[PDB]
Ligand binder design. Structure first.
Ligand code: HEM
Length: 457
């Protein structure tokens, strides 16, 4: 039962690269997985990886004593602006363990309670925007979610107000950031990056990094002009010592983590929120039940921390939006030693493996036959999901540090949304998923009718 591995078509020197020469590479990998099964080899010029789609292979991948986080090419290029921040550093880089030890406390339950007020502040700004639209007017979903989540990481993390709801155009940071990630996406499909032909692209990349470093500058400046102003994530970056050594972070690493958390703390959550709303409006029973639960639980003018915790059905909706379209759809791993996966595929020390999460999430042997159906009632019982069947937040010590932050935000927001408005899919919208690294619905528009429920000062 040692088997040889499936591969899609190669094309000489270009290997499998041409199969992923689209703006949607993940969705295309998904389609290759449907043809080829639970594992395929995937080559590009000098770099192999193997894409895994089934729970039974992925649970072995997720054994930490056999595999460790790999930087995929995407994360490798991303190092050019996020450096050795928590997302783009090797497990064995000194700064991974150090910053993880320093910053973990900032995502505890005490820290979540502390972030809560400022989460509401922004969420209230969202509702007010929507209350304030005229009759003829509609809502751009991903755009406002993006405004909401960026402002939330910024305020709760750093006490910096992007004021996205004061703007009709995306914030400068966003513009630069998307373009920097866009470049990152674009380099992945160049056969010859060397070619002098991409000259203002390389220059345009540098401009956008500098713009990100521009914003980071202001944040360390605004904080230099106060300090009492609050106690948050930035404080901990500046003042926290690594209990394992006594050392705090150095300034260079701190610029990296700030960039890392503004990026990773807004993009994925933003797509989760649009997806969830996409699914509510396509599925009347869920919409209705979410509204029933919001009305039942959100009894004070703004939500409390304890009240967001009580929104179980919203939790279920969120998990089922993440099942179907996990907004960070992939993470990379390499074998720490020669090892044999599912007793069928011998791997060499250093061989790379890719977890294809939307396929993992579509694994019939684990999830049942109705995997394409959006059915949040399948999450009624959380302990019934088998180990490593559900992984939108990655794996082990390298899993999402901001997981609770993300779910708390999206639960609160989605709850408030269904408390205050009815939603109409007035264009009968067709799902279109734009990929940067993360996933998000494109062109998703709705109309809200206000339930006209006052919203506390
Ligand atoms: C629902 C939204 C989110 C999703 C689906 C998501 C998903 C993920 C995934 C899949 C990973 C592992 C990546 C890998 O193994 O290469 C990760 C890591 C990480 N996430 Fe998130 N994330 C989300 C939101 C957030 C938020 C709100 C923050 C911060 C406020 C954040 C910060 C991080 C950090 C710092 C890491 C790297 C951890 C380490 O290796 O030490 N993420 N996330």
């Amino acid at each position: 039962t040692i088997k040889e591995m499936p591969q899609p078509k190669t094309f000489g020197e270009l290997k499998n690269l041409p199969l992923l020469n689209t703006d949607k590479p993940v969705q295309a990998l998904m389609k290759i997985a449907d043809e080829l099964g639970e594992i395929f080899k995937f080559e590009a010029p000098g770099r192999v990886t193997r894409y895994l789609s089934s729970q039974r292979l992925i649970k072995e991948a997720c054994d930490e004593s056999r595999f460790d986080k790999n930087l995929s090419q995407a994360l490798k290029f991303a190092r050019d602006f996020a450096g050795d921040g928590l997302v783009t550093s090797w497990t064995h880089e000194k700064n991974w363990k150090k910053a993880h030890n320093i910053l973990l406390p900032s995502f505890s339950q005490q820290a979540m309670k502390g972030y809560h007020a400022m989460m509401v502040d922004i969420a209230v700004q969202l509702v007010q925007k929507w209350e304030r639209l005229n009759a003829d007017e509609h809502i751009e979903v991903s755009e406002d979610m993006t405004r909401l989540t960026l402002d939330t990481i910024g305020l709760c993390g750093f006490n910096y107000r992007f004021n996205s709801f004061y703007r009709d155009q995306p914030h400068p940071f966003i513009i630069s950031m998307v373009r920097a990630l866009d470049e990152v996406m674009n380099k992945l499909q160049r056969a010859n990056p060397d070619d002098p032909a991409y000259d203002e692209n390389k220059r345009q990349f540098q401009e956008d990094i500098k713009v990100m470093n521009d914003l980071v500058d202001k944040i360390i400046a605004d904080r230099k002009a106060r300090g009492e102003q609050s106690d948050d994530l930035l404080t901990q970056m500046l003042n926290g010592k690594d209990p394992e050594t006594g050392e705090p972070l150095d300034d260079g690493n701190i610029r990296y983590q700030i960039i890392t958390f503004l990026i990773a703390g807004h993009e994925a959550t933003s797509g989760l929120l649009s997806f969830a709303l996409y699914f509510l409006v396509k599925n009347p029973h869920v919409l209705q039940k979410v509204a029933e639960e919001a009305a039942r639980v959100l009894v004070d003018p703004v939500p409390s921390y304890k009240q967001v915790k009580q929104l179980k059905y919203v939790g279920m909706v969120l998990n089922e939006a993440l099942r179907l379209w996990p907004t960070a759809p992939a993470f990379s791993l390499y074998a720490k030693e020669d090892t044999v996966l599912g007793g069928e595929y011998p791997l060499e020390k250093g061989d790379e493996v890719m977890v294809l999460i939307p396929q993992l999430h579509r694994d019939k042997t684990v999830w049942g036959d109705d995997v394409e159906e959006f059915r949040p009632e399948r999450f009624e019982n959380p302990s019934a999901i088998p180990q490593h069947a559900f992984k939108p937040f990655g794996n082990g010590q390298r899993a999402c540090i901001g997981q609770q932050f993300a779910l708390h935000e999206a639960t609160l927001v989605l709850g408030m949304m269904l408390k205050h408005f009815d939603f109409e899919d007035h264009t009968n919208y067709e799902l279109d998923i734009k990929e940067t690294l993360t996933l998000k619905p494109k062109g998703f528009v709705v109309k809200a009718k206000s339930k006209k429920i006052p919203l506390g000062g």
